[PDB]
Design a protein around this ligand. Structure first.
Ligand code: CA
Ligand code: CA
Ligand code: CA
Ligand code: CA
Ligand code: CA
Ligand code: CA
Ligand code: CA
Ligand code: CA
Ligand code: CL
Ligand code: CL
Ligand code: CL
Ligand code: CL
Lengths: 366, 366
């Protein structure tokens, strides 16, 4: 195996296939990158045995086919540390990979490519394309509502659902939920899968905000995403994910509208004097007014009063203010709508000018 | 006690006296800010019993004299959380301190000002002034060479020495040393003191880069620095701080000059394949050439060759590459001079254009 590639044509793929900072790995070889030269292409692969990242680099300079594996971080750091425009010449010498550029020389330990884990081929059952910006919006809208290392593994992931011409994400941890839907202009089969946290992170990381579209393929136990000359694949998560349709309050009779930032800053200040564990705040809604209160065990108290748009019946309700602040921070908009029912029911929160995303927060008895 | 102050006039002082995050106070009340209204001035004080930060703010709106203490972080966060232009009205009502602005109300728990530790008065023995830029230069030149939680506490601090018309800082961890001297245009007595790590951090934090000169007072066991309407005091550290004059190599006549960035990038690449614990690299100097090599226990190897300016005798020497990189990162200059003796002696490193700072690194047997 031999190749010579310009620094700039290696750096991006090497970064693409790096994956998360974890370790120590199950096998030593999982800390290595698989390098394969065949048919005029260098392929670079990283895996943790469940997800896999593969980049392809066309080789315009002379090259010889073959494969090896090398320490991923060291190889990347070497390439990154070389000067702009550097010609990175790679070859094998016994059990080492030689990397040479100008008067810089490196010798890295290898492990056999034949020993690198090859995940099984699988069959696509659902396929669609969408802009990178749409995937970005879908994941960012909901990601914060995924559970955190819950024993119910399925809540730690994110639902991806096709219905009609829309892709939808749902995330929930039992206490609050987020759902976002976006049209992608294709007739889709009705289907849903659960992508694990680590897969969601990589789906986000692979977006570069350039013009390449995202091509997705869903199998029975896997999902693949292609962007340019990069492929990411992840296992799916088993389990039945909650139906968002059952979580949206059935028929909220009361609607409140307010400036997002004004509302956010009022909750943020009140939150300072809320219980550090339970984070409870109380809302009192009245004609065009919201009063927010908070107190903690040492009897410190916050009160905020705001003008808002509200003509419904007066009511009182408690919420975990972190959950509310999470939502207002994910809504990146001028005005918000809160859809209420009563003090023992959930609230739905949305951009006042868009129903693309909805958020549900359950009340607290206070 | 009563005052009303405009938010932006309160925020800077509150931040000035906040001190470090991640605090373990040795008395609960040290988590509180001391507020004192007297003679038309609000003073704000924070302390950990060893250092103390005091800000004074002139009160142009009605006020009433008195003192109390309140949780520091909550008070700051409340004021920071209020909108731009907010007027903050504060009133002490027994066990509670009321903080109100617009339609935002807060009540904070108080502890009596009478219970707030008052550090003893002490006598200045050495005094001088200097531009803030000179203090910044002196600290930034040497701070990185202080030890990291060494059991010899003096090594964790920074020596401040007056000699002639110069102020000098020295920092060392027992293996590498940094020293920087700057003229301050005043005839000084000969004196040296050790400022603890936390004091160095605050000396740096209190610089605003404005025209306010730094006024320094040194006593037998304390130091004080005044800038504008802010005073910082720190206890000094006991111990026998190393004499930099004995650490500088006596006759380092073999002088090598090289571009800082080229030297740095070569060391940074070689470092990748150095021992992760011991970080050893070897330097081979010869006419107008430097070769750097590194290897680790897996027998991975790096080699770098650069052109340099060198007409001395040939020699090799081993160094901890992290220490060398730390120096080159601190220098921020075009060219560097390395001043060598032999394979069992230390190296002195300087900006080739300035002798105001010097750095010493001990050799390694490799
Ligand atoms: Ca990588
Ligand atoms: Ca070389
Ligand atoms: Ca495969
Ligand atoms: Ca999962
Ligand atoms: Ca209404
Ligand atoms: Ca005032
Ligand atoms: Ca009190
Ligand atoms: Ca005092
Ligand atoms: Cl190329
Ligand atoms: Cl370079
Ligand atoms: Cl400060
Ligand atoms: Cl030579």
């Amino acid at each position: 195996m031999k190749f010579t590639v310009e620094r700039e044509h290696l750096l991006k793929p090497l970064q693409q296939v790096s994956g998360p900072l974890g370790g120590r790995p199950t096998l030593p070889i999982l800390g290595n990158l698989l390098l394969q030269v065949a048919d005029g292409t260098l392929s670079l692969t990283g895996t943790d045995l469940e997800m896999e990242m593969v980049a392809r680099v066309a080789l315009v300079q002379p090259h010889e086919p073959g494969a090896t594996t090398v320490p991923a971080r060291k190889f990347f750091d070497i390439c990154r540390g070389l000067p702009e425009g550097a010609e990175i010449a790679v070859q094998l010498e016994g059990e080492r990979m030689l990397v040479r550029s100008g008067r810089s020389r490196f010798s890295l330990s290898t492990l056999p490519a034949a020993d690198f884990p090859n995940l099984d081929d699988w069959q696509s059952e659902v396929e669609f394309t969408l802009p990178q910006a749409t995937m970005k919006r879908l994941i960012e809208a909901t990601q914060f509502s995924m559970a955190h290392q819950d024993v119910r593994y399925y809540l730690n992931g994110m639902l991806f659902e096709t219905e009609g011409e829309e892709l939808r994400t749902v995330a929930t941890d039992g206490h609050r939920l987020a759902v976002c839907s976006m049209p992608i202009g294709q007739s889709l089969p009705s289907h849903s899968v659960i992508v694990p946290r680590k897969g969601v992170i990589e789906l986000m990381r692979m977006l570069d905000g350039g013009d390449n579209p995202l091509r997705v393929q869903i199998g029975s136990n896997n999902i693949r995403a292609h962007v340019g000359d990069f492929i990411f694949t992840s296992k799916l998560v088993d389990g039945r994910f909650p139906d968002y349709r059952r979580v949206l309050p059935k028929n909220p009779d009361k609607h409140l509208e307010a400036g997002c930032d004004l509302l956010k800053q009022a909750f943020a200040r009140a939150a300072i004097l809320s219980n550090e564990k339970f984070r409870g705040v109380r809302l009192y809604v009245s004609e065009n007014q919201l009063k927010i209160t908070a107190n903690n065990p040492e009897q410190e108290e916050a009160e905020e009063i705001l003008d808002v748009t509200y003509s419904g019946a007066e009511m009182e309700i408690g919420f975990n203010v972190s959950y509310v602040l999470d939502v207002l921070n994910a809504l990146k908009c001028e005005n918000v709508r809160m859809m209420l029912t009563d003090s023992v029911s959930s609230v739905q929160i949305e951009d006042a000018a868009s129903q693309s995303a909805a958020y549900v927060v359950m009340p607290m008895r206070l």
